[PDB]
UniProtKB/Swiss-Prot annotation:
Gene: FABP4
Cellular localisation: Cytoplasm; Nucleus
PROSITE patterns assigned: FABP
Protein species of origin: Homo sapiens
One GO cellular component, as annotated: cytosol
Protein name in the entry: Fatty acid-binding protein, adipocyte
Length: 134
């Protein structure tokens, strides 16, 4: 067992705040924002030894990343940014930093009651995405 086990499971999006605004900060175009913003993704988190995998399934895009904490990796994001990512565990929060073209965004995941809360921050804009177990 590991602390990261509180994250493992299948999670369904149940609420969103400021996603469209967050996407505008990322430079996502109109059509992509509209389609992405309509999606009700599920996220599947699993752990196998030191490897964590985060898989998103949706009607917009399906993505999968696997990584080791603290070890940089290449990621092509759902909106087709090519980024360098590093994911750490900081006091129980999964912290994911994406770097591309001199820009940065941070995605934090935390357990809160029976929910998994994803916070996406770009510049002054915070989006909150709340999931429950599927
Ligand atoms: C973490 C992440 N970051 C994003 C950044 C930008 C855009 Cl456009 C989309 C995402 C998505 C996503 C949202 C809806 C459907 C599918 C994927 C997610 C994700 O939940 O997996």
């Amino acid at each position: 067992s590991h602390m990261c086990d509180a994250f493992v499971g299948t999670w369904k999006l149940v609420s969103s705040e400021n996603f469209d605004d967050y996407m505008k900060e990322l430079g996502v175009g109109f059509a992509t924002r509209k389609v992405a913003g309509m999606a009700k993704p599920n996220t599947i988190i699993s752990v196998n030894g030191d490897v964590i995998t985060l898989k998103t399934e949706s009607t917009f895009k399906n993505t999968e990343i696997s990584f080791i904490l603290g070890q940089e990796f290449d990621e092509v994001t759902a909106d087709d940014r090519k980024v360098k990512s590093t994911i750490t565990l900081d006091g129980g929060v999964l912290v994911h930093v994406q770097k591309w073209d001199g820009k940065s965004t941070t995605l934090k995941r935390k357990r809160e009651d029976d929910k998994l809360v994803l916070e996406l921050v770009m510049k002054g804009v915070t989006c909150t995405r709340v999931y429950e177990r599927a």
